[PDB]
Amino acid sequence: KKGVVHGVATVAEKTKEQVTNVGGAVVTGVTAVAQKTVEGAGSIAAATGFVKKDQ
Amino acid sequence: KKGVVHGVATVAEKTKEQVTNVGGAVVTGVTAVAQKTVEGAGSIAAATGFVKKDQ
Amino acid sequence: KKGVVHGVATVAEKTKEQVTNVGGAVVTGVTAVAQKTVEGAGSIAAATGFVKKDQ
Amino acid sequence: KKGVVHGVATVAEKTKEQVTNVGGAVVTGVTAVAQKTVEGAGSIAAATGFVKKDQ
Amino acid sequence: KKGVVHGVATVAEKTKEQVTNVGGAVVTGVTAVAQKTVEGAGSIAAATGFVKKDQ
Amino acid sequence: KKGVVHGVATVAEKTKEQVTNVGGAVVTGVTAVAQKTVEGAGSIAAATGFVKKDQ
Amino acid sequence: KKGVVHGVATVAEKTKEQVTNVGGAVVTGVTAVAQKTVEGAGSIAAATGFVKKDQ
Amino acid sequence: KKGVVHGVATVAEKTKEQVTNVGGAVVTGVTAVAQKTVEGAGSIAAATGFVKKDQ
Amino acid sequence: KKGVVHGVATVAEKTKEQVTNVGGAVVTGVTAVAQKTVEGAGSIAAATGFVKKDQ
Amino acid sequence: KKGVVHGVATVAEKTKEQVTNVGGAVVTGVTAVAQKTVEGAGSIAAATGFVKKDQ
Amino acid sequence: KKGVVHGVATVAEKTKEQVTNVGGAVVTGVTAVAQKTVEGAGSIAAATGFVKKDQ
Amino acid sequence: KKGVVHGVATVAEKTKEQVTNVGGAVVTGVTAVAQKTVEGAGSIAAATGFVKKDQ
Ligand SMILES: Cc1cc2nc(/C=C/c3ccc(O)c(Br)c3)sc2cc1N(C)CCOCCF
Ligand SMILES: Cc1cc2nc(/C=C/c3ccc(O)c(Br)c3)sc2cc1N(C)CCOCCF
Ligand SMILES: Cc1cc2nc(/C=C/c3ccc(O)c(Br)c3)sc2cc1N(C)CCOCCF
Ligand SMILES: Cc1cc2nc(/C=C/c3ccc(O)c(Br)c3)sc2cc1N(C)CCOCCF
Ligand SMILES: Cc1cc2nc(/C=C/c3ccc(O)c(Br)c3)sc2cc1N(C)CCOCCF
Ligand SMILES: Cc1cc2nc(/C=C/c3ccc(O)c(Br)c3)sc2cc1N(C)CCOCCF
Ligand SMILES: Cc1cc2nc(/C=C/c3ccc(O)c(Br)c3)sc2cc1N(C)CCOCCF
Ligand SMILES: Cc1cc2nc(/C=C/c3ccc(O)c(Br)c3)sc2cc1N(C)CCOCCF
Ligand SMILES: Cc1cc2nc(/C=C/c3ccc(O)c(Br)c3)sc2cc1N(C)CCOCCF
Ligand SMILES: Cc1cc2nc(/C=C/c3ccc(O)c(Br)c3)sc2cc1N(C)CCOCCF
């Protein structure tokens, strides 16, 4: 076989899960957050996949 | 087989789940948030997939 | 087989779920949010798939 | 087989769900929000798929 | 076989999970956060995959 | 076989899991955080994969 | 002060919430159930406060 | 002060929450259940407060 | 002070939370269940407070 | 002071939390369950407070 | 002071937490379970407080 | 002071935590279980407080 990509690719066979991202956010997984009190200014309480590039 | 992509591709066979994103947000997964009190200015309480690029 | 894409593609066979996004938001998954009080100015309380690019 | 796309495509066979988006928003999934009090100016209380690009 | 990529690629066969990211965040895994009180200004309480590049 | 990459690639066969990242965050693994009280200003309480490059 | 009860009482002052039950069911709290498929004969899918005394 | 009870009482002062139960079920707390597929005959999927006394 | 109870009592002062139960079930706490597939006959998947006295 | 109980009592002062139980189940605490697949016949997957007295 | 109990009592002053149980189950504490696959017939996967007296 | 009990009592002053149990299970402590695969028939995977008296 032959393949040429510029990116971003994701090429496969017999594949149970696939995610391609440029951005941006993708949530595909099981996630449970239980929480009782959030205070403070300002605290990232429960972050799973996170990116902060403030300018 | 032969394939040429510019991106972003996601090419496969026999594949249970697929997500392609440029952006942007995609939520495909099970997610449960239970929460009782959020305060503060300003706190990201429960973030799963998150991207903040303020300018 | 042969395939040429510019992107964004998502090409497959025998595939249970598919999402293609450029944008933008796509919500296809099970999601439960239970919440009792949100305060503060301004706090992202419960974000699952999120993108903030304010200019 | 042969396929050439400019994007955004989503090409498949035997496929239970499909979403193509450029925009914009698409909601196809089960979603339950129960909520008791929202205050503050201005707090994103419960966001599932979200994109904010204010200029 | 032959392959030439510019990156970022992810090329495979017989592959159970795949993630390609440029960004950005991708959450595909099981995650449980249980939490009782978050205070302080400002403390990253529970971060799983995290990136902070404030300027 | 032959392969030329610019990076970042991840090329394989018969491969159970794959992650490619430039960024950014990717969470694909099982993660359980149980927590009772977070205080202080500001303390990284429970960080699993973490990167802080404040300028 | 003086008090004599036979039960079931609930006596208080300055009290934000009160429930007295003999029975029976009382639901006063925030509750969110999101659900996609229930099968089987017969499975209690999502029970919060539950009592089964079949004879 | 003086108090004589037969039960079940709940006597207090300055008290934020109170529940008295004989039965029976009382749900006063925040609860989020997100769920995707329940099968089997018969499996208690997600039970929070539960009592089964079949005869 | 003086107190005589038969039970079940719960007597207090300056008390943030109170539960009295004979039964029966009481749910007053924050609870998040996220779940993707339940099978089998019959398996208690996620039980928090649970009592089974089948005869 | 003087007190005579038959049980079950719970007598106190200046007390943040109280639970009295005869039964039965009481859930007052923060609880997060995230789960991806439950199989088998029949396996107690995730039990927190549990009592099984089958006859 | 004077006290006579039959049991089960729990008598105190200045006391942050109290639990009295005859039964039965009481869950008052922070608990996080994250889980990916449960199989087998039948295996107690993750048990925190547990009692099995089958006859 | 004077005290006569039959048991089970728990009598105190200035006491941060108290548990009285006859049964039965009580969970009041912080607990985190993260788990990836459970198999076998039948293996107690992760047990914290456990009692098995099958007859
Ligand atoms: C193997 C492969 C296969 C492949 N298949 C495609 C789509 C076909 C199609 C089939 C039917 C359609 O209708 C359409 Br539209 C499209 S792209 C693609 C790319 C590749 N590679 C780059 C792998 C080479 O490994 C080099 C590493 F050294
Ligand atoms: C400067 C910049 C540079 C940049 N470079 C990229 C790589 C693309 C690529 C990806 C994979 C490839 O193979 C190739 Br070739 C190329 S995205 C990107 C975004 C930015 N920004 C400043 C947008 C942030 O918005 C401001 C916040 F408000
Ligand atoms: C990482 C971080 C992230 C973070 N993110 C925010 C979002 C605000 C917002 C964003 C978007 C909105 O729409 C609104 Br309203 C509000 S505050 C904040 C604070 C922090 N930290 C300081 C902890 C770093 O610790 C360094 C060493 F200790
Ligand atoms: C500067 C920039 C740069 C940029 N570059 C991209 C890469 C595309 C690509 C992706 C994959 C590829 O293979 C190739 Br080639 C190319 S998107 C993008 C967006 C931006 N912005 C500033 C928009 C933010 O809006 C302002 C917020 F209000
Ligand atoms: C400066 C910069 C540089 C940059 N360089 C990249 C590499 C791409 C690549 C990746 C893989 C490759 O093989 C090749 Br070739 C190339 S992304 C990127 C983004 C930026 N920014 C300043 C955007 C941040 O936005 C400001 C926050 F508001
Ligand atoms: C502890 C246990 C508990 C347990 N509980 C069930 C509930 C069924 C049900 C109960 C109520 C309902 O309404 C329905 Br429908 C269904 S199966 C089960 C199995 C077990 N074990 C096998 C572990 C014993 O260790 C063996 C060797 F060590
Ligand atoms: C046999 C029995 C006995 C029993 N004993 C109790 C104690 C009360 C007490 C509690 C605290 C005290 O201080 C004193 Br004194 C007394 S409840 C109770 C319920 C039963 N049942 C068989 C009902 C189950 O229904 C059948 C299922 F379908
Ligand atoms: C046999 C029995 C005995 C029993 N004894 C108790 C103690 C009360 C007490 C509690 C505290 C005290 O200080 C005093 Br005195 C007394 S409850 C209880 C329940 C039962 N059963 C068989 C009901 C189960 O139902 C069958 C399942 F379907
Ligand atoms: C100290 C105490 C205090 C107490 N107070 C009650 C309710 C008053 C009330 C007050 C106002 C009302 O309106 C009502 Br109704 C009722 S029962 C009780 C029991 C006791 N003890 C047994 C402790 C003795 O320690 C012996 C150990 F050695
Ligand atoms: C046999 C039995 C005996 C028994 N004894 C207790 C002690 C009370 C006590 C507790 C504290 C004290 O100070 C005093 Br005095 C007394 S409860 C209890 C329950 C039972 N059963 C068979 C019920 C199980 O139901 C069948 C399952 F389906």
Chains A and L touch, using 3 or more CB pairs below 8 Å: no
Distance from the Cα of A52 to chain E's closest Cα (Å) equals 5
Resolution (A): 3.1
CA distances from K25 to A54, C46, I55 (A): 48, 31, 19
The residue of chain J nearest to residue L45, with distances taken between CA atoms, is: J45
The CA distance from D30 to the nearest CA of chain B, in Å, is 9
Touching pair G, F by Cβ (3+ pairs < 8 Å): no
- Give the residue from E19, F45, G4, J36 showing the smallest Cα distance to H11: G4
Distance of CA K50 to the CA centre of its chain: 8
CB of K25 within 6 A of ligand 10: the answer is no
Sorted by sequence, the CB contacts under 8 Å of residue L32 that are 6+ apart come out as E34, F32, F33, F34, K31, K32, K33
Our mutation pick for probing the ligand 6 site, out of I39, I50, I52, I53, counting the most ligand atoms within 8 A of Cβ, is: I52
Residue H43's identity, in one-letter code, is S
Q: Which residues pair with D34 in a beta bridge?
A: C34
Report the SS3 class of residue L48: strand
Answer whether K3's CB lies under 8 Å from L3's CB: yes
Report the sign of the C-alpha dihedral through residues A28, A29, A35, A40, in that order. negative
Ligand 3 centroid distance, CA of A50 (Å)? 10
Which residue among A8, A52, A55 is best mutated to probe the pocket of ligand 2, counting the most ligand atoms within 8 A of its Cβ? A8
What's the maximum distance between 2 C-alpha atoms anywhere in chain D? 56
* CA angle (E18 as vertex; D31, J38 as ends), nearest 5: 55
C-alpha G51 chain-centroid distance = 9
Could you give the CA distance from residue K11 to residue J36 in angstroms, rounded to a whole number?
43
What secondary structure, in 3-state letters, does chain E show?
CEEECCCCCCECCCCCCCEECCCCEEECCCEEEECCCECCCCCCCEEEECCECCC
Size of interface A-F (CB pairs under 8 A): 16
Instruction: For A4-33, give the secondary structure using H, E and C.
Output: ECCCCCCECCCCCCCEECCCCEEECCCEEE
**For residues H15 and I15, is the Cβ–Cβ distance under 8 A?**
yes
Q: Which chains touch K (3 or more CB pairs under 8 A)?
A: E, F, I, J, L
Measured distance CA(J47)–CA(K46) in Å, rounded: 6
Experimentally determined by: cryo-EM
Token duo for residue G21: 């039950």
| 8 Å CB contact between B14 and A14 | yes
d(CA F6, CA E6): 5
Non-local (6+) Cβ contacts of B20 within 8 A are A20, B8, B9, B10, C8, C9, C10, C19, C20, C21, D8, D10
Q: Measured between alpha carbons, how far is D1 from G34 in angstroms, rounded to an integer? A: 41
Q: Quick check: L34 and F36 CB within 8 A?
A: no
Other CB atoms closer than 10 Å to residue C2's CB: what's the count?
12
Region of H6 (left: φ > 0; alpha: ψ -120 to 50; beta: rest) is alpha
Alpha-carbon span G26 to B34, nearest angstrom: 20
For residue C30, give the nearest of H30, H31, H34 by CB distance. H34
Q: How far is the CA of J34 from the centre of ligand 10 (A)?
A: 35
Dist. CA K47–CA K44, nearest whole Å: 7
How many of the other CB atoms lie within 10 Å of CB of B1?
13
DSSP conformational letter for G6: -
Q: Distance (Å) from the C-alpha of residue C46 to the closest C-alpha of chain G?
A: 14
I52/H42 Cα distance (integer angstroms): 14
C-alpha distances (whole Å) from E7 to each of D4, F9, F10, J29 are 21, 6, 9, 48
